[PDB]
Structures are given as C-alpha cells and as structure tokens.
Structure 1
C-alpha cells in the first residue's frame, strides 16, 4: 500500500481522478455495478474500494464510513493517489415539512457541526461545495426526473444529540444543542447528515472538487438509495 489505511497503490487506480464516496461499505459494489468492468480493489476497516469504467475512463468508488474522521482519512489517502474530484452519495433525514421521503437533496454548503473540518480550516471558512460538482449533480437529478431540493445541510459529528434526538439512553441534550433543530429549521436548513462538513471543507480548502447528494430516508417533521446512486453516477459522467 502507498497509503496507511486504504491498502491501495497509485497503480491500482489506473489513472482515475474522480471518486464516488458513499458512507456505507456495502453500498460500494452496488455503485460500481452500474458501471463497466467493476473490480474490487481492497477492503480494510470501513474502507471498501472498487474500480470501474465510466465512458471508458477509470473511476473509483470508496466508502468513507460514518463521520468526518474516517471521511478525512479516505479523502486524504485518495488525494495522495491522484483523486481530484469527490462525489459523496448519502442518506439523510429532512427537517423541512415540504421535503418528502424519497426526494433527493443537493448540498451547496454545510453547517459545520463537526470537529474534523476545523483541522483543515478555521470555523469562519465555508464548508461549500464545488460549483461544477453541484451543477452536475443538479443536472443529473433532473436528468432522471427526481424531485430535487438544493440548499444548506447541517453536518453533525453525532447521530443523536447533535441532531437533537431525545430517543436516547440519557434522554437529554447538552445546552449548546437544546433548541438547535428549530434554529436550523427556521434558517432553511434542509437536512442532517454526518460527513459533508468535513468533506466539503477539506476539499474546498485544498483545491479539490467535491459535491454532495443524498436521498431522504426520513422526515423529522412529518428504491430511494437506487435513485440517488443513479444520480451520482450520472453526475460523475458529466465531470469526467
């Protein structure tokens, strides 16, 4: 391995410069199977990596695991191996009543409720997505006629208190996060997830292109995975 965690060398990538990065290791082969000549390259910890061919060009699919820290490792090591464009495809809970389960969300920038982003840029730096990547994702979405919303996402280091869930062992939330969901809702934030603040900040601050799409699996105020996967693959096609 050329890198500490992924168990990959630059030769393994066959010159690929674009990666699709789902959170779940099990989703990797599913994404790769939509493309040509899919092959498994490696699997270590939460990092499962497949290579495939899109319009004759090699593309990588690599899982990040849950959270900014594991995401930061995958992105950095892929960047060392030559990846320059990163498309995250995820699952999220919507926090707006007009967003329905099954819809797709394209993130322009994220509320940084994570710690890893701070390791790349101070808090005042925006966790903003690459304009070309966002454009490609929005177009891909419309391309298959998915119901699409574009806007801000809250990206949390936690699934529970950081997303103001009380269905927990302790049944309480630290002061800092009390009333936070209502605040983000009032500010128009679409959804919660757990990797975008780290991904977008680390790429935007290092000259790497990143974009973010997710299928809504729940709505906190009130099939889809395959929809979102089709979209991220089609967006990749436009960025090759």
Structure 2
C-alpha cells in the first residue's frame, strides 16, 4: 500500500495513539485493548487497532526523530485517513517547573531541525497542536486528577546534544523538556489538516540528574496511557 505500513485500507480507526517504541505500542495493545489485531509490521514497526471501553482505537509506532515520525504520520493521514493523532512518550525535563512523573502537554514544539524551514518559506513555523485536542486533554486530565504541566517542548535532531549548555536558555523560554518528534508531528498535521497533540512523561531530568526506578517508569507510563485512551473516548 505504502512502503512503510503493511495494513489494508480501513485497518486503522480514525483516532490513533503514537509512540516511537513499537514494543511500547505492543504493550498498549495487550494490557489495555480488547480485540486488538496487529495490523502493520514493516521494519518491525508495529501497529494494532482494538477496543478500549467498547470504543475503537488504533495504535502505531513511529520510530525516532522528526524524519521518521514524519514518514509514518504522513502515510497515516493520506493513505489510512487517520483524523486524530495522540502522541505519548518519554521526554527529558529541562525546567524547574516540572519533575519526575509529571505529564507535559506540549502547546508548541520548538526545534533545531531544518524541516519546517524547508516546509515554510525558510521562515519560523510555530509548530502547535490542534486546539480542541489540547482542550480535551486538559478536561480529561482534570476529570482524572492529573496535574497536567503545560508548556513548550524542544524537538531535537540530536539525542546526544552538542548544545547542552543551551538547556538553561530553553527552560527560560518555557520549554519544559526535550524530545525528538513533536515538531515534525505538529508540522505534518498542520500540512495535512489533521488534529494532533503530544503528551510527554518525565522520567529523567537532564538538569537535576534525578531519575526514577524501572518500575516507577512502567508505573508512570501506565498513568499516561489511561489519560490518552480516556481522551480518545
């Protein structure tokens, strides 16, 4: 169908959850969905489709970096007609305003990537989510009692930064954490008139060097699935 997704047309529901790690996505399908039938597995990048509280939901891994995320989100919108893309995952905090376990809602995605300048006249595309999803995440959060931290994130092309000295500046300008796909996902979705949002769970503070225990991490990530699926319904 498309070189990166194995599914037949109609295998995806119009709402889809996204993570870079497919084994993470396979863990969502099992612990949380009912029917759940693996629908794609090109390059071992798995996606699922199943039911949560009787409502249909799809899941899909997108890999690491803006370019990889862009590839999958583009095919999900144009070929599989996904209408809402809710990204979840881990991010390293850089701000004193957040700490371990927090869930960060990204109202904007800064970037050191060139992709949006190629996309957008060599100007500064402000990469933002769809507002009603952000609204929905806020409401669903409060309904569950989750202190949702809301700010920007910085999407970088480097996992191992060459500019760690710049983390303090990014925090000053209201970036609560660093990750690597939100700006690509946000730009792809504005390109293709789809509804996207990124949520991030704080498991490592790049500044206070604090970190959790591998069971607190599966604990925390579990607390994020619930909000993501409760808000897809």
Query: Normalised by the shorter chain, which TM-score bucket?
Result: 0.7 to 0.9
Task: Tell me, in whole angstroms, the C-alpha distance in 1 between the residues paired with 2:223 and 2:116.
Answer: 29
CA gap of 1:84–1:50, structure 2 versus 1, over 3 A, is same
Q: Residue by residue, what CA displacement relative to the aligned partner does 1:14-54 show, whole Å, maximum 9, x if unpaired? A: xx211111111111122223133111112122521101124
Matched with 1:217 is: 203
Task: State the partner residue of 1:171.
Answer: none
Q: Counterparts of 2:194 and 2:10 in 1: how far apart (Å)?
A: 20
> TM-score, normalising length from structure 1?
0.85
Given the superposition, is the C-alpha separation of residues 147 and 68 from structure 1 closer, same or farther in structure 2, using an over 3 Å criterion?
Answer: same
How much has 1:106 moved relative to structure 2? 0.4
Mark the CA change 1:5 to 1:217 in structure 2 (over 3 Å): closer, same or farther.
same
Matches of 1:24 and 1:214 in 2, distance apart?
14
Question: Residues of 2 paired with 1:130 and 1:20: CA distance?
Answer: 15
Which structure 2 residues correspond to residues 85-96 of structure 1 after superposition, within 5 A? 85-96=84-95
Is contact 2:117–2:125 with CA below 8 Å preserved after alignment?
Answer: no
Instruction: Report the counterpart of residue 128 of structure 1 in structure 2.
Output: 128
Change (3 A) 1:30 1:118: farther
Q: Quick one: structure 1 residues 148 and 201, their matched pair in 2 at CA, closer, same or farther if it must change by over 3 Å?
A: same
1:230 aligns with 2:226: yes
2:80 maps to: 81
1:217 and 1:46 map into 2 onto residues whose CA distance is: 25
Q: Counterpart of 1:43?
A: 41
- Taking the aligned partners of 1:18 and 1:189, their CA distance within structure 2 comes to 27
3-state secondary structure, aligned to 1:11: coil
Shift of residue 55, structure 1, vs aligned partner: 4.8
> What is the CA–CA distance in structure 2 between the aligned matches of 1:155 and 1:145, rounded to whole Å?
28
Q: Which range moves more in the overlay, 140-149 or 209-218?
A: 140-149
Aligned to 2:145: 145
- Deviations along 1:89-116, one digit per CA (max 9) or x if unpaired, are 0101111123110110000011122244
1:121–1:201: 8 Å Cα contact kept in structure 2?
Answer: no
Query: Which segments of 5 or more consecutive residues in structure 2 lack a partner in the other structure?
Result: 209-218
Of Structure 1 and Structure 2, which has the larger fraction of its residues in strand?
1
What SS class does the counterpart of residue 151 from structure 1 fall into? strand
SS of 2:40's partner is strand
Quick one: distance in 2 between partners of 1:44 and 1:18? 20
- TM-score for the superposition, normalised by structure 2: 0.87
In structure 2, the CA distance between the partners of 1:217 and 1:127, relative to structure 1 (3 Å rule), is same
For 1:136 and 1:142, the matched residues in 2 are separated by: 10
**Deviations, residues 101-150 of structure 1 (Å, cap 9, x unaligned):** 01100000111222444453344221000001111222232233223200
Residue 19 in structure 1 maps to residue 4 in structure 2: no
Check if 1:112 corresponds to 2:98.
Answer: no
